[PDB]
Amino acid sequence: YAIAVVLSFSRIAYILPANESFGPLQISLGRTVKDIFKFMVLFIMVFFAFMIGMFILYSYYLGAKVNAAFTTVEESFKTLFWSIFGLSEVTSVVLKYDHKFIENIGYVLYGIYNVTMVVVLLNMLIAMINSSYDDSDVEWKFARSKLWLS
Amino acid sequence: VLTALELSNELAKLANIEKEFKNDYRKLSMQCKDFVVGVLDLCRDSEEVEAILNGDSLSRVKLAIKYEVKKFVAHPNCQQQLLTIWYENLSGLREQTIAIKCLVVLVVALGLPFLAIGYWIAPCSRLGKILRSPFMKFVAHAASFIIFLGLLVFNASDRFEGITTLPNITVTDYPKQIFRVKTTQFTWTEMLIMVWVLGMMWSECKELWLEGPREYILQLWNVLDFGMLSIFIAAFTARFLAFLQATKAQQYVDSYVQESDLSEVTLPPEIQYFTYARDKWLPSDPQIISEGLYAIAVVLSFSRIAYILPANESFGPLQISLGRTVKDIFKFMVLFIMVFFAFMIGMFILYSYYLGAKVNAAFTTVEESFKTLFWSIFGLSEVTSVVLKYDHKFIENIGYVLYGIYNVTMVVVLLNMLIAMINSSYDDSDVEWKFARSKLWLSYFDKTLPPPFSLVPQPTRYQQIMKRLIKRYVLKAQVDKENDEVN
Amino acid sequence: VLTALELSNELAKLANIEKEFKNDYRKLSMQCKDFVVGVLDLCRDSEEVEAILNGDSLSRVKLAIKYEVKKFVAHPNCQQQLLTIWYENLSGLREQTIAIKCLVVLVVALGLPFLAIGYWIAPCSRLGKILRSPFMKFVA
Ligand SMILES: CCOC(=O)N1CCC(c2cc(O)n3nc(C)c(-c4ccc(C(F)(F)F)cc4)c3n2)CC1
Numbered sequence: 188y189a190i191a192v193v194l195s196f197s198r199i200a201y202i203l204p205a206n207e208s209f210g211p212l213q214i215s216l217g218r219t220v221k222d223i224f225k226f227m228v229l230f231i232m233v234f235f236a237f238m239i240g241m242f243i244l245y246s247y248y249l250g251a252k253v254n255a256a257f258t259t260v261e262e263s264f265k266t267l268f269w270s271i272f273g274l275s276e277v278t279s280v281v282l283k284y285d286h287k288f289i290e291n292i293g294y295v296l297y298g299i300y301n302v303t304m305v306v307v308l309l310n311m312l313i314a315m316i317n318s319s320y321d322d323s324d325v326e327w328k329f330a331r332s333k334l335w336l337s
Numbered sequence: 338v339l340t341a342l343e344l345s346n347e348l349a350k351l352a353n354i355e356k357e358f359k360n361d362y363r364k365l366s367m368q369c370k371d372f373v374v375g376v377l378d379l380c381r382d383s384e385e386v387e388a389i390l391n392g393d394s395l396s397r398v399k400l401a402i403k404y405e406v407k408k409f410v411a412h413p414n415c416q417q418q419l420l421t422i423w424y425e426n427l428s429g430l431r432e433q434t435i436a437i438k439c440l441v442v443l444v445v446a447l448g449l450p451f452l453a454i455g456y457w458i459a460p461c462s463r464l465g466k467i468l469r470s471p472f473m474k475f476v477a478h479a480a481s482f483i484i485f486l487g488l489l490v491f492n493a494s495d496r497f498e499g500i501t502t503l504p505n506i507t508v509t510d511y512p513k514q515i516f517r518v519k520t521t522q523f524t525w526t527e528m529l530i531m532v533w534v535l536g537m538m539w540s541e542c543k544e545l546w547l548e549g550p551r552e553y554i555l556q557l558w559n560v561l562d563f564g565m566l567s568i569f570i571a572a573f574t575a576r577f578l579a580f581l582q583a584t585k586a587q588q589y590v591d592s593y594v595q596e597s598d599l600s601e602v603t604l605p606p607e608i609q610y611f612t613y614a615r616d617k618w619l620p621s622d623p624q625i626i627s628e629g630l631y632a633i634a635v636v637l638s639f640s641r642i643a644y645i646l647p648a649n650e651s652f653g654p655l656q657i658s659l660g661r662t663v664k665d666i667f668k669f670m671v672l673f674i675m676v677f678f679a680f681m682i683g684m685f686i687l688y689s690y691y692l693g694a695k696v697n698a699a700f701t702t703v704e705e706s707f708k709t710l711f712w713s714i715f716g717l718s719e720v721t722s723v724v725l726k727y728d729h730k731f732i733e734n735i736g737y738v739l740y741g742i743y744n745v746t747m748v749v750v751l752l753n754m755l756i757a758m759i760n761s762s763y764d765d766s767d768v769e770w771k772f773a774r775s776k777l778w779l780s781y782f783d784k785t786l787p788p789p790f791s792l793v794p795q796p797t798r799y800q801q802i803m804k805r806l807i808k809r810y811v812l813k814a815q816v817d818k819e820n821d822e823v824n
Numbered sequence: 825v826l827t828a829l830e831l832s833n834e835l836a837k838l839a840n841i842e843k844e845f846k847n848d849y850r851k852l853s854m855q856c857k858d859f860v861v862g863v864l865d866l867c868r869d870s871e872e873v874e875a876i877l878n879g880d881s882l883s884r885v886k887l888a889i890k891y892e893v894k895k896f897v898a899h900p901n902c903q904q905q906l907l908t909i910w911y912e913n914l915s916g917l918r919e920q921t922i923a924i925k926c927l928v929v930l931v932v933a934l935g936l937p938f939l940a941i942g943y944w945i946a947p948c949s950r951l952g953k954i955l956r957s958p959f960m961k962f963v964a
């Protein structure tokens with residue numbers, strides 16, 4: 188029911204095209220969302236690469252790690268997903284044992300993953316800026332005309 | 338056309354060498370490329386297309402790829418030939434959707450060992466022609482690398498939900514067995530991955546010996562692939578060394594002491610160390626090195642998908658744009674290093690004398706300063722890293738000011754990089770992607786089995802065609818010039 | 825105009841199928857769309873606009889929407905007809921501001937069950953024509 192309530196407010200895309208101010212707004216949002224998926228596939232590829240790599244590294248330290256963030260597949264996915272928005276602490280790759288090799292490799296891999304996320308984000312932003320260019324006006328009017336004819 | 342291509346090469350080389358009149362030489366090279374493209378454009382039959390694409394084996398296409406003549410290779414007159422050759426001996430698959438092609442890839446992946454075994458009769462069999470096509474080679478290699486990734490993932494099985502036993506506790510199949518024997522022994526999946534990596538390493542070694550180390554290292558991505566395989570080999574060598582030590586301990590324990598149980602025996606400390614858990618392992622243990630290098634290798638192993646993406650149409654320009662951005666990054670990233678090292682050394686000098694005084698040791702040593710200022714880029718470093726426990730407000734305030742200036746500099750450089758590599762962006766993207774995909778296609782034309790399975794053992798008619806094409810080009814150029822100057 | 829629209833469909837489909845000469849087929853489809861738009865542009869009376877918008881029911885508008893002919897449907901000569909049909913049987917509301925339209929939406933929302941109950945007499949009632957308009961359907 189909570190998921191349904193979250194999705195229930197998405198029907199406003201049936202009402203926005205009739206409006207004049209928010210028509211091109213929704214058109215641009217739809218174009219950006221369509222452009223997202225192509226880059227988001229590569230997001231999945233890189234994210235899964237680092238997720239499996241760090242899970243393999245830290246799977247043997249379930250109780251050794253101070254914060255279990257890569258010990259299992261689910262925690263690795265959670266931590267590397269929340270690292271995109273910065274909500275994951277940097278102390279996720281430090282151990283309680285004096286195995287500095289594993290800890291340092293985890294630090295390096297985490298830094299490389301964050302750098303890759305930044306690089307891919309800027310690449311996506313630049314590409315879907317360049318992909319942007321009364322074409323917007325005629326596109327919005329076409330969408331509104333489809334809504335009218337509906 | 339060959340003269341124009343070699344002249345384009347010479348003009349590009351002289352543009353690189355001169356660096357004073359680089360614009361003029363680049364313009365001349367573009368003129369040569371435009372002439373080649375225009376000569377190719379006037380084709381009206383497959384015979385003329387073939388004649389331009391190779392002289393009296395796509396020799397001219399390969400020679401244009403070598404000279405980075407993007408528009409000649411991405412031209413539809415050449416793409417129509419490259420697609421016919423690429424989809425050779427299987428034409429019905431060209432018109433199928435992407436989903437059908439992915440289904441074919443999955444079918445090949447499921448039955449790859451079966452078709453590999455049957456390849457012995459393939460030269461005399463009808464299906465051998467299909468399996469020898471330039472496309473089924475790519476599908477076989479892609480399904481092979483996907484199987485390798487699946488093997489890497491499945492090797493980490495039994496730990497997806499987490500190890501059931503704590504690191505502090507040792508588990509032995511029988512009481513007389515050394516724990517390191519249990520933890521270092523190769524599973525069948527690891528043995529298969531070893532064969533896989535040795536196959537890829539043999540392929541790369543053969544390629545390197547055929548080509549030459551200098552220009553082999555000249556390519557950046559080949560260096561990355563070689564480093565990936567070297568890291569895999571180093572990890573497996575460390576694992577094998579750990580296995581050797583464990584099995585030496587196992588031989589020793591049954592060699593001298595004869596007791597029903599191993600716990601009651603006071604083994605020599607060298608051998609007794611092998612009955613320890615992870616908590617008591619040395620920091621430089623061979624197994625630790627093996628696990629770290631294997632994790633790095635697994636991280637780098639999914640980067641080979643850049644060999645599969647260019648063949649696709651949707652993700653081709655995606656990878657092209659990503660590569661362009663990555664190439665643009667390094668120039669700004671050098672300045673990132675400069676500024677980052679400036680602030681890192683400055684703050685380390687400031688806070689090196691407060692090792693125990695600082696509430697959070699974040700700048701007391703060189704390593705902590707580097708760690709903190711690197712993580713400050715992504716915001717994961719706390720702001721309390723520059724506050725002391727002593728009442729020395731001068732040092733603390735200067736640290737605060739320097740940290741703020743460093744963050745401002747990072748923001749400024751990030752926006753500068755973003756703006757510059759937006760402006761650096763501008764069917765050029767289309768022709769670039771088609772050129773990359775054509776290079777990928779030509780990489781498979783003439784390499785039949787996947788890496789793991791490769792271990793097993795009246796002047797002239799062409800002159801007439803060229804004369805006709807050049808006569809047509811001269812007539813077209815004259816018509817275009819005089820039509821624009823009729824008045 | 826119908827021939828040009830079907831030819832634009834065929835050229836777009838062949839551009840998708842070929843993927844080698846996609847630029848040429850897309851250019852031809854754009855030529856067909858431009859011809860359709862230019863034919864629509866020369867209208868000077870409502871009769872000619874209607875004749876282009878449907879043959880001997882906005883058949884051509886629907887068929888152009890199906891073929892993604894954006895410029896033919898977004899042309900003012902077609903928008904003037906689509907707005908007259910959209911604001912059918914209530915013309916005074918077209919010139920009102922967005923605030924008045926939102927007030928109308930709120931009024932309908934408050935009295936939606938009442939008008940739904942009264943819809944039984946609506947076909948014989950004056951307000952049934954308003955409630956059956958293409959706009960009041962969207963507001964409802
Ligand atoms: C990618 C980001 O990953 C990270 O966060 N790291 C990777 C490196 C790790 C580390 C661990 C250690 O024990 N030590 N000890 C020393 C002397 C250094 C050191 C640090 C920096 C430099 C440089 F600045 F000159 F490059 C040279 C040497 C050092 N580093 C810390 C976490």
Ligand SMILES: CCOC(=O)N1CCC(c2cc(O)n3nc(C)c(-c4ccc(C(F)(F)F)cc4)c3n2)CC1
Nearest residue numbers: 720730733734735736737738739740741742743745
């Ligand atoms: C670059 C960011 O660096 C930082 O975070 N800081 C730098 C300044 C530091 C500091 C320490 C102190 O003891 N005091 N005492 C006073 C009265 C001020 C003060 C603060 C602000 C202003 C202004 F807003 F008017 F500019 C004037 C005076 C003040 N500041 C705090 C950390």
